[PDB]
Design a protein around this motif. Structure first.
Motif, short mmCIF file in Angstrom:
data_model
loop_
_atom_site.label_atom_id
_atom_site.label_comp_id
_atom_site.label_asym_id
_atom_site.label_seq_id
_atom_site.Cartn_x
_atom_site.Cartn_y
_atom_site.Cartn_z
N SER A 632 0.80 -1.22 0.00
CA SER A 632 0.00 0.00 0.00
C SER A 632 0.83 1.27 0.00
O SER A 632 0.76 2.05 -0.96
N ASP A 633 1.66 1.51 1.02
CA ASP A 633 2.24 2.83 1.24
C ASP A 633 3.76 2.89 1.25
O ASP A 633 4.30 3.99 1.13
N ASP A 634 4.46 1.77 1.41
CA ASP A 634 5.91 1.85 1.46
C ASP A 634 6.44 2.21 0.08
O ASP A 634 6.67 1.33 -0.75
N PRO A 657 5.39 3.67 6.36
CA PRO A 657 4.33 4.18 5.48
C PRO A 657 4.33 5.70 5.41
O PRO A 657 5.02 6.39 6.16
N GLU A 658 3.54 6.22 4.47
CA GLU A 658 3.45 7.65 4.23
C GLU A 658 2.29 8.31 4.95
O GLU A 658 2.36 9.51 5.24
N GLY C 36 3.40 0.59 11.73
CA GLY C 36 4.00 -0.35 10.80
C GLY C 36 4.98 -1.35 11.40
O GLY C 36 6.03 -1.60 10.81
N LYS C 37 4.64 -1.92 12.55
CA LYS C 37 5.42 -2.99 13.16
C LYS C 37 4.59 -4.26 13.23
O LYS C 37 3.40 -4.28 12.91
N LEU C 38 5.25 -5.34 13.65
CA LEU C 38 4.55 -6.59 13.89
C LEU C 38 3.75 -6.50 15.17
O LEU C 38 4.26 -6.06 16.21
N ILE C 39 2.48 -6.91 15.11
CA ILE C 39 1.66 -6.88 16.32
C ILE C 39 2.25 -7.84 17.34
O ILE C 39 2.79 -8.89 16.96
N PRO C 40 2.20 -7.53 18.64
CA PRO C 40 2.77 -8.41 19.67
C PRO C 40 1.86 -9.58 20.05
O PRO C 40 1.62 -9.85 21.23
N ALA C 41 1.36 -10.29 19.04
CA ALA C 41 0.52 -11.46 19.27
C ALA C 41 0.68 -12.42 18.10
O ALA C 41 0.86 -11.99 16.96
N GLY C 42 0.64 -13.71 18.40
CA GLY C 42 0.77 -14.71 17.35
C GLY C 42 2.22 -14.99 17.05
O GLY C 42 3.00 -15.29 17.94
#
Ligand SMILES: Nc1nc2c(ncn2[C@@H]2O[C@H](COP(=O)(O)CP(=O)(O)OP(=O)(O)O)[C@@H](O)[C@H]2O)c(=O)[nH]1
Ligand SMILES: [Mg+2]
Ligand SMILES: [Mg+2]
Ligand SMILES: [Zn+2]
Lengths: 708, 585, 63, 237, 21, 83, 226
Positions: A632-634, A657-658, C36-42
């Motif tokens: 999408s945005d990167d 992202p933007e 834009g990071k990995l969620i802290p679950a799973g």
RNA sequence: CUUCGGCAGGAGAGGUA
């Protein structure tokens, strides 16, 4: 879409506008049926989205006061005898008297047979009163329905929602190339076509002199001549085809009001929106699971359900600061195998077949002999035959706009056949999508070898309460085959109320069942048992309306009889050729760098909030991150992902992202001090980064196309 | 598996197709391959079939009310422009084939592909994550086929006749193959009682214990069974080591069988069994013989006597009012009850007349679809209708939809169709706002440990004593005591301990506790967990969709919210075929 | 304040946070989704993400 | 004309009396015109032989016990209706079964008169335990298909002959399934998977070569009408 | 009826219409 | 086991793959990391030799690295230390 | 016992386009499978001839009109899909039609070439005025089944050529009936009565020989196992 | 190694699941 939709667009009452209600302010008491709507507004025909109850249709017999109040006609009964004087009454005056019903037992002299009659009182309550104070009577049944609802046979056997859906779905039928009239219908298809205006009607009596496919000349009784012109292959507002065909000979005598030429969905003057198909009602191997439909291959070989669809394309030559633009076949340095259909002026030739990515009008604009190239190419997925061209030029005395020098319009036509995914419907709320098209030799067939045309499932009939379709099927079989009731000794008790000329019929007869006064079940049961045989002396359908069938794949007969008959099927304007879309990479927006939206331009599919909840509940953290940043945005990772896929390496890590940066800028612009910190303070700058973003591929990632 | 059109596949898989085209010397550089794919050259279609192999795709339908609104499939190339979808996955998606559309997404990286293939595959998600009840199970046509196949009709062709004198047995068979050969010729029916000598099918528990006792090595052990051919055909679709059933396949029986298979067998076995059941049901639905005609809708034999009796009983109340004694509201409340009685007498006349083999009765009674209210409305009498407010109109509708309503009867019936179409469009906001609020309140709850080593807990009911002397099972025990970790040893009569601390309460454990006599036990709940952030895997307990203990790293709050908010939005949109009798969602 | 502002009543929450000089630790599902990071679950928690895989000695020797 | 793609046959031996043949690529539609014809012409056309009637000494009125044996009469009929016999005569042959003393009566002790052959000689029939006797007389006719029990023709001429059903076909179970294949870019061709299980008296592959001959001689009647009337041709191998 | 050249379509109706649409 | 032969995505059976790991979330990262190693080996073949080895199991005609990784895991040829 | 009487075919003509064939004695159970094999082969795989394209004089596409003709080019294309033609060549063959003046254009004006016969002699293509001319050129080919239209760009043709669809099947209706003599003594048999109807292009007997040949050529992939 | 030169916001109405 068709004559019915145009005739229904008018005669339509809207509760919204500048001075009316709103779509969220309106509550639940204004979108309901009131007892004072009887004979003024139809209680069935209405939208089913957020506009339900706020849009209606005028009734058949209603008119409007000079002040603006709706009136309906009533027939005056005085001293127990029903007169013939008609009085138009508004609601205020109507709620003061007692109004009887149209189906009252008149004794052929005005006198009610039964003393007690059913009436409508002031508060909408229904009570029984003696025939001494009744003062008005309904002029007919069907007085309370509209013109689209009055074309559904066996309306009283259907529930309200199915009837609503059928009435609304009758206006989405597409005009077919043949348009044969229904076998069993109501009496409303004749007058709904003359008043719509899509047929040619003679204005004076006379004798026809000469007939062609382009005009008709009629000679009047006083020596004056009048000629009528016909519209051939004219595009409609929705992209369908409007055609008119003469239905008179070269020596016929016409009268004032006689129909002279046909129209889009008209057959011999009557409205015809579908075709008659032989129906078998049974499950079949799971191909008609959950409202799906199985079709025959004869309906494709013989073009039973075929439609013409036209499209218009336009271009203009406007004045540019660096010089005007012009239309010629001088496309700077391009192969000569792609400029073979263009004529001298630089427009395609009539009769040529065009595909996706073909030049229609060649145009060049001075860039920054400054010659760029901007030509009219055929949009993606389209294809047809160029059928017409219109050119307007400034010099040639033309009232063009301001700063324009030439406008060209090109028309492209196609012939679409029936295929998987197209939507079909009947008049009783049936709807479904074509699941399979079967060969002729592997469909169930009757004892004489006649294959069926369409198979419908039996699991969707009883729980939806639309059983008028089975009654229509029985009556359609009876009408198609023909009948004759044996009356050698008197007349059977079940045929006592049948009129004359209904005791004997010939094959392929046309009958009419009015909306609330039609064929009772007793007469249908009687007619099903006196039916003429086929070419040989055999009776295929027994007294119950059931036939024995064979299996087209194995050959063994089916162990039980199946219900067979004839039904009227319409083709709806929801086709799978105009619904399929896919994209890998294309144009992007300007403020945010996300993909565009829509099918007209290559646009992506929104991955909303609820899908994020689903992917979080699954536990998939890498799929979500890749969906939300790289795809999408990167802005920097998109080209890297493309190059990694093309060269066969691993997919690199995402970045930032933007939309976050845009949000930060807006928050700053609201006089708010937002900053991103690190493990020891030291606010991160968040400023781009000197990149060696040199294109070592040179092949527009997608935002564009490709030229040589 | 799913079916993907060729044009959509070519548009989605462009970079891979270009890479393979340049690799196979079909083009010279990347730009040439891009142009060649853009213009749809004939050589393109050879490499698509090998670049789409074993690459999953994600399918989604709106609205996404719960977790199973997105599933991953293995694509195959089909001719046309429509997507083909498996019949058994239409319950999770809530999809019908009358104009629906779905979206397609393509995983790119290795982690995304692994997640789509392992976590989100459609063959791994069969049970509902809110209650554990199966979702990919036969319905509609398949239920009718499987109900027709497994049915015993007396007096059918070739039945077993226990006679003597001249003919010894007249109906006993030596193997299923002989029975099939007899059925083909037309000497036997698949729904007639016979005796077969079965070899490769497990006997029931009692018969096994009586004949073999020690161990029934079924590969070659023979026993005699009295059943029908259809039941043998049905039992040949289950796993090898599953005992004979010998029942009539109602919907609940099939649900119980699928639940037992899921709880005792690996998931690949269940996924392979449901397809066989679907195939057999689809085959036999067409030969069941269910069709709708106008000589199948039978009318109640005596309905004019019933409605004349109730009409003369309502004329009394009418005259009484008129003269004067009854207040208006009491005349309306008398009439309402006279007509609620007459609709029940027509209802009970209709159940008596109708035979037990009418397609209309068969479809509803088999559990496939519909209720008996709709059957009574179609053939008997509709009854009382509501007004634009919510009250009852003292005038009933006496005619069915088979005879046809009158004009005033049809006008006063359109009030109930507007309320039921104006709900779907207007009152779904009340459920989606509640779902959004519920999702946002509970998003920091995540399983973070394995055991917090606590002693606190809550106490559940688990049946009650009766004055007679017996024990009555609690009405709702499957949603209060099943799938919960036990917190304190359940000692019986100051003695032997039936279950020790740490056991998960299943069906055998509940049976043992009930037999021993323990009434109240205390379990471990989420409201008494001692971990700081989130929750632990022992206090939470068992995972509804998986069947084992919940894993570390699971987002349980989202699941909770989705499971509380989906039912009310779905029921809000299905508010016309609710059956009345009381209130609604 | 990011989650509260993205839930409801953005203006009031932003005003209170600005006056009170709040700070966000970025330890939630919504914030990790937004930035834009990995969620802290799973599969995004530390136990499963930092995993090392190598072939066993016998398999390396045989091939 | 020409089919443009010649079809081929295969075989995938699963056991020793159960195989799976595959015919592909069959032109659109021709997968459903050959499967039920092969099935029926495999389960009702090959000539075989079977036991048709029995006579047990001592059982005349009550048909529910045999003094000496431990089983019933139903289980003896069910154990004699599973004998794999093969004859080469053309008139009803008569064999005998004679055993005495506590012992398991197998199918080897059936003394076949010159003409008949017992293929399964270790099959159980009964087990005597009370110093009893089992004199059994059998009639072994020959024919094709499955024939239900023939109700006594010379009724009163038989004092204790129990008619039984006769399985004459050497094939026991056949199934077929039509799949879909792909040639060029037409995803429209067919694939016929057959599955033939036989008795230990013939091979699974001699049946798909004894059923293919009787069909070429039944569809050759339509060809004799005009032997110059055109059709579709495949070619050689 | 009432239209000069309308096709013949027999009707099942039992009542009479005093008024025209 | 009591099942027919698997085909396509369903090979190898997941119930047999889940007895070598602790949870469903460990198998994903296991397979993904092994697939990345295999791809690195394939792409760095003709140039400088790298420490990454693979595939251990013989590959098919055209097999993606993820399928090879899953077949390697099922055959007990790798070892992992969860962190 | 083993019967020793093999079947025999016998035709009982009833008209000129219809016939009835009696195949007896058949084995108990083999009456419907042979009927459906013959019905599935007759109604699909019989070769014929059909018109594959036309070219009118002043016409470039089908969405237009001619001067003097009371029909458009689409109704002429829909009235030229009921022509029964026979060919004896393996190549495109061109016929011609030339009519003018007040009259009705029937199917007996097409001058057939050398080895092409037109059966339907009284059809109806169009009707002209006293200022109308019709010049048409048709192309007759050979094939099997139903082949859709072939675009002009797939053959490198001109602009006036209108490609029409081609239905090559010469058979109209096929049905069967199977009585059965299921008595005691288990001496049973069958009897198939097939009924073929054609379209004047062939005879009801020259089509069953084509079907018998296709089926004696496809069922011979098993006999080779010996 | 390819010089310049070439784009995408709001408002309203009607429909589908
Ligand atoms: N979120 C929304 N979904 C809608 C809306 N309108 C329709 N739909 C969707 O269409 C679906 C309607 O499907 P149905 O009315 O046929 C429910 P069902 O098939 O179970 O009953 P039957 O028609 O008797 O078979 C509904 O469940 C939604 O998924 C809407 O306004 N909002
Ligand atoms: Mg539905
Ligand atoms: Mg739907
Ligand atoms: Zn805890």
């Amino acid at each position: 879409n068709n004559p019915l939709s145009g005739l229904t667009h008018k005669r339509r009452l809207s509760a919204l506008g500048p001075g009316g209600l709103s779509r969220e302010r309106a509550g639940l008491e204004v979108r309901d049926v009131h007892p004072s709507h009887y004979g003024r507004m139809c209680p069935i025909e209405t939208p089913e989205g957020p506009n339900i109850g706020l849009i209606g249709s005028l009734s058949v017999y209603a008119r409007v006061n000079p002040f603006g109040f709706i009136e309906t006609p009533y027939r005056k009964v005085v001293d127990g005898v029903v007169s013939d004087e008609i009085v138009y009454l508004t609601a205020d005056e109507e709620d003061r008297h007692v109004v009887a019903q149209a189906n009252s037992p008149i004794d052929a002299d005005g006198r009610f047979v039964e003393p007690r009659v059913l009436v409508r009182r002031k508060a909408g309550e229904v009570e029984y009163v003696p025939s001494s104070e009744v003062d008005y009577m309904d002029v007919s049944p069907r007085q309370m329905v509209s013109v689209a609802t009055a074309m559904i046979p066996f309306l009283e056997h259907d529930d309200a929602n199915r009837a609503l859906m059928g009435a609304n779905m009758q206006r989405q039928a597409v005009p077919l190339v043949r348009s044969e009239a229904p076998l069993v219908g109501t009496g409303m298809e004749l007058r709904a076509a003359i008043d719509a205006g899509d047929v040619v009607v003679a204005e004076e009596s006379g004798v026809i002199e000469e007939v062609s496919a382009d005009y008709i000349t009629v000679m009047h009784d006083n020596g004056t001549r009048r000629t009528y012109r016909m519209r051939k292959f004219a595009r409609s507002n929705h992209g369908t085809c409007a055609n008119q065909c003469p239905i008179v000979d070269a020596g016929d005598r016409v009268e004032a009001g006689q129909v002279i030429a046909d129209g889009p969905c008209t057959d011999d003057g009557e409205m015809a929106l579908g075709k008659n198909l032989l129906v078998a009602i049974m499950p079949w191997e799971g191909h008609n699971y959950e409202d799906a439909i199985i079709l025959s291959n004869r309906l494709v070989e013989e073009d039973v359900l075929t439609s013409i669809h036209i499209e218009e394309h336009e271009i203009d030559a406007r004045d540019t600061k660096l010089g005007a633009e012009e239309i010629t076949r001088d496309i700077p340095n391009i192969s000569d195998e792609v400029l073979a259909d263009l004529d001298e002026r630089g427009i395609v030739r009539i009769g040529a077949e065009v595909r996706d990515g073909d030049i229609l009008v060649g145009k060049v604009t001075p860039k920054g002999r400054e010659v760029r190239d901007t030509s009219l190419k055929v949009p993606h997925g389209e294809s047809g035959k160029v059928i017409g061209i219109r050119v307007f030029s400034r010099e040639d005395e033309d009232e063009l706009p301001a700063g324009v020098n030439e406008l060209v319009r090109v028309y492209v036509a196609q012939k679409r056949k029936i295929s998987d995914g197209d939507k079909l419907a009947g008049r009783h709320g049936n709807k479904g999508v074509i699941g399979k098209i079967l060969p002729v030799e592997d469909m169930p067939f009757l004892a004489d070898g006649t294959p069926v045309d369409i198979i419908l499932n039996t699991h969707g009939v009883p729980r939806r309460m639309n059983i008028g379709q089975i009654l229509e099927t029985h009556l359609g079989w009876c009408a198609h085959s023909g009948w004759k009731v044996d009356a050698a000794k008197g007349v059977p008790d079940w045929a006592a109320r049948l009129p004359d000329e209904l005791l004997e019929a010939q094959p392929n007869a046309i009958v009419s069942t009015p909306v609330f006064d039609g064929a009772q079940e007793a007469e249908l049961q009687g007619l099903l048992s006196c039916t003429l045989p086929n070419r040989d002396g055999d009776v295929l359908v027994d007294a119950d309306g059931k036939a024995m069938l064979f299996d087209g794949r194995s050959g063994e007969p089916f162990p039980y009889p199946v219900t067979v008959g004839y039904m009227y099927i319409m083709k709806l304007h929801h086709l799978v050729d105009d619904k399929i879309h896919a994209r890998s990479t294309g144009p992007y927006s300007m403020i945010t760098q996300q993909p565009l939206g829509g099918k007209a331009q290559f646009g992506g599919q929104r991955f909303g909030e609820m899908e994020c909840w689903a992917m979080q509940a699954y536990g998939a953290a890498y799929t979500l991150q890749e969906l939300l940043t790289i795809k999408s945005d990167d802005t920097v990772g998109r080209v890297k992902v493309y190059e990694a896929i093309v060269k066969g390496e691993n997919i690199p890590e995402p970045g930032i992202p933007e939309s976050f940066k845009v949000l930060l800028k807006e928050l700053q612009s609201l006089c708010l001090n937002v900053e991103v910190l690190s493990s020891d303070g030291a606010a991160i700058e968040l400023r781009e980064g000197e990149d060696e973003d040199l294109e070592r591929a040179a092949a527009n990632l997608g935002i564009n196309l490709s030229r040589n | 598996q799913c079916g993907l059109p060729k044009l959509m596949a070519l548009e989605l898989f462009k970079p891979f197709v270009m890479k393979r085209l340049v690799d196979l010397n079909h083009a010279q550089n990347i730009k040439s391959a891009k142009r060649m794919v853009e213009r749809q050259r004939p050589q393109v279609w050879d490499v698509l079939e090998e670049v789409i192999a074993e690459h999953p795709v994600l399918l989604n339908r709106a609205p996404t009310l719960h977790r199973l609104g997105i599933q991953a499939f293995e694509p195959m190339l089909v001719e046309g422009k429509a997507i083909q979808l498996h019949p058994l996955v239409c319950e999770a998606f809530n999809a019908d084939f009358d104009g629906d559309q779905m979206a397609v997404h393509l995983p790119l990286s290795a982690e995304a592909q692994a997640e789509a293939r392992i976590l989100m595959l459609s063959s791994n998600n069969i049970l509902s994550p809110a209650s554990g009840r199966p979702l990919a199970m036969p319905r509609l046509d398949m239920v009718t086929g499987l109900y027709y196949l497994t049915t015993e009709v007396p007096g059918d062709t070739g039945e077993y006749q226990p006679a003597s004198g001249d003919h010894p047995e007249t109906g006993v068979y030596s193997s299923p193959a002989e029975a099939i050969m007899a059925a083909d010729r037309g000497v036997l029916s698949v729904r007639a009682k016979i005796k077969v000598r079965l070899t490769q099918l497990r006997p029931p528990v009692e018969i096994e214990a009586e004949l073999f006792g020690h161990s029934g090595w079924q590969p070659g052990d023979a026993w005699m069974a009295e059943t029908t051919l259809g039941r043998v055909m049905f039992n040949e679709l289950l796993p090898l080591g599953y005992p004979f059933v010998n029942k009539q396949m109602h919907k609940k029986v099939q649900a119980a069988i699928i639940n037992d298979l899921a709880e005792r067998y690996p998931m690949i076995v269940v996924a392979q069994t449901v397809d066989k059941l679907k195939d057999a049901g689809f085959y036999w639905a067409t030969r069941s013989g269910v069709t709708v005609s106008m000589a199948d809708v039978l009318v109640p034999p005596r309905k004019k006597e019933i409605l004349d009796h109730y009409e003369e009983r309502a004329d009394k109340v009418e005259k009484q009012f008129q003269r004067g004694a009854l207040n208006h509201d009491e005349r309306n409340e008398a009439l309402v009850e006279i007509w609620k009685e007459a609709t029940d007498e027509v209802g009970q006349a209709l159940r008596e007349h109708y035979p037990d083999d009418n397609p209309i009765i068969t479809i509803v009674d088999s559990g496939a679809t519909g209720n008996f209210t709709q059957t009574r409305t179609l053939a008997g009498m509709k009854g009382l209708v509501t007004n634009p407010k919510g009250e009852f109109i003292p005038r009933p509708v006496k005619s069915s939809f088979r005879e046809g309503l009158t004009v005033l009867e049809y006008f006063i019936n359109t009030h109930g169709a507007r309320k039921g179409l104006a709900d779907t469009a207007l009152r779904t906001a009340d459920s989606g706002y509640l779902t959004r609020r519920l999702v946002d309140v509970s998003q920091d709850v995540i399983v973070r440990e394995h055991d917090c080593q606590t002693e606190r807990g809550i106490v559940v009911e688990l049946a009650e004593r009766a004055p007679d002397g017996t024990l009555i099972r609690d009405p709702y025990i499957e949603t209060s005591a099943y799938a919960r970790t036990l917190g304190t040893d359940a000692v019986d009569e100051a003695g032997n301990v039936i279950v020790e601390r740490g056991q998960d309460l299943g069906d055998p454990e509940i049976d043992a506790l009930l037999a021993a006599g323990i009434t109240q036990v205390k379990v471990r709940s989420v409201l008494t967990c001692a971990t700081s952030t989130g929750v632990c895997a022992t206090c939470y307990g068992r995972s509804m969709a998986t069947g084992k203990l919940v894993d570390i790293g699971e987002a349980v709050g989202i699941v909770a919210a989705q499971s509380i908010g989906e039912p009310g939005t779905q029921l809000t949109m299905r508010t016309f075929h609710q059956g009345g009798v009381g209130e609604d969602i | 304040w990011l989650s509260a502002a993205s839930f409801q009543e953005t203006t009031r929450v932003l005003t209170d946070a600005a006056i009170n000089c709040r700070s966000d630790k970025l330890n939630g599902l919504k914030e990790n989704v937004i930035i834009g990071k990995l969620i802290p679950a799973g599969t995004g928690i530390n136990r499963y993400r930092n995993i090392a895989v190598q072939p066993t000695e016998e398999a390396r020797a045989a091939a | 004309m020409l089919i443009s793609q010649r079809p081929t046959l295969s075989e995938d031996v699963l056991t020793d009396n159960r195989s799976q043949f595959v015919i592909e690529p069959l032109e659109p539609g021709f997968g459903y015109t050959l499967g039920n014809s092969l099935r029926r012409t495999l389960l009702s056309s090959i000539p075989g032989a079977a036991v048709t009637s029995i006579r047990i000494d001592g059982v005349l009125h009550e048909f529910t016990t045999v003094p000496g044996v431990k089983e019933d009469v139903t289980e003896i009929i069910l154990n004699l209706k599973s004998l794999v016999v093969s004859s080469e005569e053309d008139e009803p042959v008569t064999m005998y079964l004679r055993k005495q003393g506590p012992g398991e009566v197998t199918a080897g002790d059936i003394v076949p008169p010159a003409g008949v052959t017992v293929h399964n000689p270790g099959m159980h029939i009964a087990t005597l335990n009370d110093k009893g006797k089992l004199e059994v007389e059998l009639v072994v006719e020959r024919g094709r298909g499955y024939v239900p029990a023939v109700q006594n023709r010379a009724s009163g001429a038989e004092i204790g002959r129990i008619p039984v059903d006769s399985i004459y076909s050497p094939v026991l179970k056949v199934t077929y399934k039509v799949d879909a294949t792909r040639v060029e870019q037409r995803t429209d061709f067919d694939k016929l998977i057959l599955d033939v299980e036989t008795k230990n008296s013939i091979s699974p592959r001699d049946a798909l070569a004894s059923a293919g001959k009787t069909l070429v001689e039944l569809f050759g009647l339509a060809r004799e009408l005009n032997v110059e009337a055109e059709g579709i041709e495949i070619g050689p191998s | 009826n009432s239209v000069p050249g309308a096709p013949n379509r027999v009707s099942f109706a039992k009542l009479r219409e005093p008024l025209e649409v | 086991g009591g099942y027919d032969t698997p085909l396509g995505i369903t090979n190898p059976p997941i119930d047999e793959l889940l007895d070598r790991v602790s949870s469903k979330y460990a198998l994903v990262i296991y397979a993904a990391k092994r697939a990345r190693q295999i791809n690195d080996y394939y792409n760095q073949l003709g140039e400088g030799i790298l420490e990454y080895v693979g595939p251990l199991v013989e590959p098919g005609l055209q097999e993606k690295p993820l399928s090879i990784a899953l077949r390697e895991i099922h055959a007990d040829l790798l070892e992992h230390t969860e962190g």
